[PDB]
Design a protein around this motif. Sequence first.
Motif, short mmCIF file in Angstrom:
data_model
loop_
_atom_site.label_atom_id
_atom_site.label_comp_id
_atom_site.label_asym_id
_atom_site.label_seq_id
_atom_site.Cartn_x
_atom_site.Cartn_y
_atom_site.Cartn_z
N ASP A 123 25.65 49.01 -2.29
CA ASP A 123 25.21 48.01 -2.90
C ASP A 123 24.72 46.98 -1.87
OD1 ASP A 123 28.14 48.08 -2.17
OD2 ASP A 123 28.24 46.14 -2.82
N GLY A 124 23.67 46.83 -1.43
CA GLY A 124 23.11 46.23 -0.64
C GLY A 124 23.71 46.29 0.98
N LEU A 125 24.05 47.59 1.21
CA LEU A 125 24.70 47.93 2.57
C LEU A 125 23.73 48.14 3.65
CD1 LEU A 125 27.41 47.96 3.66
CD2 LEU A 125 27.53 50.40 3.44
N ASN A 126 23.77 47.37 4.56
CA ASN A 126 22.70 47.24 5.66
C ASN A 126 23.56 47.57 7.25
OD1 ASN A 126 19.99 47.37 6.50
ND2 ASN A 126 19.80 45.03 5.92
N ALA A 127 22.73 48.12 8.28
CA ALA A 127 23.28 48.18 9.31
C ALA A 127 23.89 46.73 9.98
CB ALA A 127 22.40 48.80 10.51
N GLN A 128 23.27 45.58 9.32
CA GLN A 128 23.70 44.17 9.83
C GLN A 128 24.78 43.59 8.89
OE1 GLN A 128 20.24 45.21 9.16
NE2 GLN A 128 20.16 46.06 11.26
N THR A 129 24.99 44.18 7.65
CA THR A 129 25.82 43.70 6.80
C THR A 129 27.29 43.32 7.24
OG1 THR A 129 24.91 44.84 4.84
CG2 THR A 129 27.16 44.06 4.63
N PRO A 130 27.68 42.03 7.24
CA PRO A 130 29.07 41.64 8.04
C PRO A 130 30.10 42.28 7.43
CG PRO A 130 27.80 39.68 6.82
CD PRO A 130 27.28 41.09 6.44
N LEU A 131 30.57 43.39 8.04
CA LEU A 131 31.85 44.37 7.54
C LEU A 131 32.82 43.36 7.13
CD1 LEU A 131 31.48 47.32 9.56
CD2 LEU A 131 30.45 46.59 7.32
N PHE A 132 33.39 42.28 7.96
CA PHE A 132 34.56 41.51 7.91
C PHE A 132 34.62 40.91 6.39
CE2 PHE A 132 37.42 41.09 11.50
CZ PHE A 132 36.72 42.05 12.31
N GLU A 133 33.52 40.01 6.34
CA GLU A 133 33.29 39.45 5.11
C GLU A 133 33.31 40.06 3.82
OE1 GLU A 133 33.45 35.96 5.56
OE2 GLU A 133 33.74 35.60 3.38
N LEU A 134 33.04 41.36 3.92
CA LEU A 134 33.01 42.39 2.78
C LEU A 134 34.39 42.72 2.66
CD1 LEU A 134 29.81 42.80 2.72
CD2 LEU A 134 30.31 45.12 2.92
N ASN A 135 35.33 42.56 3.28
CA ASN A 135 36.84 42.77 3.11
C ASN A 135 36.90 44.28 3.25
OD1 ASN A 135 36.65 40.18 1.02
ND2 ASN A 135 37.70 40.01 2.74
N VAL A 136 36.15 44.87 4.39
CA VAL A 136 36.41 46.31 4.60
C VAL A 136 37.16 46.59 5.94
CG1 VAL A 136 35.01 48.46 5.20
CG2 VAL A 136 34.39 46.89 3.33
N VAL A 137 36.94 45.56 6.69
CA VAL A 137 37.67 46.00 8.18
C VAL A 137 39.02 45.19 7.86
CG1 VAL A 137 37.50 45.07 10.44
CG2 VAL A 137 35.47 46.11 9.47
N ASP A 138 39.93 45.87 7.19
CA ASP A 138 41.30 45.45 7.02
C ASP A 138 41.89 45.71 8.13
OD1 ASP A 138 41.08 45.07 3.81
OD2 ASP A 138 40.46 47.24 4.34
N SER A 139 43.41 45.27 8.31
CA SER A 139 44.16 45.37 9.43
C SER A 139 44.64 46.50 9.78
CB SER A 139 45.35 44.27 9.09
OG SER A 139 45.74 44.31 7.90
N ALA A 140 44.79 47.55 8.89
CA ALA A 140 45.10 48.72 9.18
C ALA A 140 43.89 49.94 9.06
CB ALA A 140 45.91 49.45 8.15
N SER A 141 42.63 49.27 8.38
CA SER A 141 41.70 50.18 8.13
C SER A 141 40.72 50.39 9.69
CB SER A 141 40.71 49.61 7.04
OG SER A 141 39.36 50.25 6.94
N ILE A 142 41.02 49.39 10.34
CA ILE A 142 39.86 49.25 11.40
C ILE A 142 40.23 50.57 12.35
CG2 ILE A 142 41.74 47.91 12.67
CD1 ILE A 142 37.91 47.82 13.03
N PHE A 143 41.44 50.93 12.53
CA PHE A 143 41.66 52.01 13.23
C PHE A 143 41.30 53.54 12.80
CE2 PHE A 143 44.99 48.95 14.45
CZ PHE A 143 44.84 48.80 15.68
#
Length: 455
Positions: A392-412
């Motif tokens: 849904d509007g996912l770009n190479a430039q989309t901000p992963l943090f503000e999307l709430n995808v780079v969680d505290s455990a999900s990053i690794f």
Amino acid sequence: GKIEEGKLVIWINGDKGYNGLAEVGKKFEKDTGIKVTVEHPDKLEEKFPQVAATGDGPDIIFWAHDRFGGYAQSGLLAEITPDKAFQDKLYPFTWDAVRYNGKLIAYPIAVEALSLIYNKDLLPNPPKTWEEIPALDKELKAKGKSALMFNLQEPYFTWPLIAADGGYAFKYENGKYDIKDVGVDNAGAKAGLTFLVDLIKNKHMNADTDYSIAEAAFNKGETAMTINGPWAWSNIDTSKVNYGVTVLPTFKGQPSKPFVGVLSAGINAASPNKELAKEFLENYLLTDEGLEAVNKDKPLGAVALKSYEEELAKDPRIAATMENAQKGEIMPNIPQMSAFWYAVRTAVINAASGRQTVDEALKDAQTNAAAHMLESKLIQHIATQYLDGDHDGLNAQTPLFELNVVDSASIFDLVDFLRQESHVAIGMHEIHPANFASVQAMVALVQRLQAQVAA
Ligand SMILES: [Mg+2]
């Protein structure tokens, strides 16, 4: 089954002769009792992999061949079984467009490629070679006109010359395209692109010429030649221009190699009507009389069936399409062409504008493509894994943090995926927001890391 037995449902684009195709289907019904239904849904090429995956959809789908490779990788197409006698009735190169991992997965129907289009009044005998074009421009410049204008913005239009002496998209070997072997960084592609840039430098062409400007210039009689496909013939103003269509010029005595698209008919792997579909395609559609029914509704252009191609080739414009297509490069049927298109678009625009040299532009293109491929892999991973598989509007430039995808455990988990797909070690000191704020940054980190160790 879940697709109805004893019936044939066909999907074809609404800009094709679907009414003529339906006439073939009626005669099939007359002979066999089996009803044929031709449908032209909007976006049928997106609907097909959705509904085929659940066991539904048409028995037969008509579409450009380059899309069928992804359908085959998902197992949605039946393997077709034409004997060698049948294969002999179609031009041999067309069968290379419909193969996936060794297997035939569709029937070729029609063939499309770029040709050289020329103003007969300004130029009754057009040039056979790219080399003699600067000399032709100077003569026509004396009368306030130019030799040649075509779209230099889109690599599909400039590839015929770049590939002439040795370019290729992806290396084809043992039945499969190698996505690590992009054929831009070699002497042949450099030679072709170099001749194109020198046309610009010697003012025979302008780097900003695009589709519309070239089309308008030709209709006004300002340029003697352009390069375009069969889709453009109806827009040539024949009240002002008497035009012809011919073989592209050679380069270093080699034919220009335009990309070839093959309209193809695939059989749904979930269809219980595979044998009826084979009978219809081989013995009703792929005949002089079947193709003529379709062609009379809406012209097919150049066709794969030799016997009917001979008839249509009485139109020299159609003969030219097939000759250029025989000398051209079949478009690879793999999703990674999107990386090729992005990488080569960039290189040709930069070479033309003086930004990079031909050498630097083409060497850079291989790296850019790999980068694009990785971005695509990541975007699909992030979507399939955190967004339900839909971009849904996912770009190479989309901000992963503000999307709430780079969680505290999900990053690794993401770091690990990056480690697997790129085979680099990623230390804790690289795991910071400016490296993971976007897919582009993650790829850039991977790209930077590969060099650090490989030196
Ligand atoms: Mg036979």
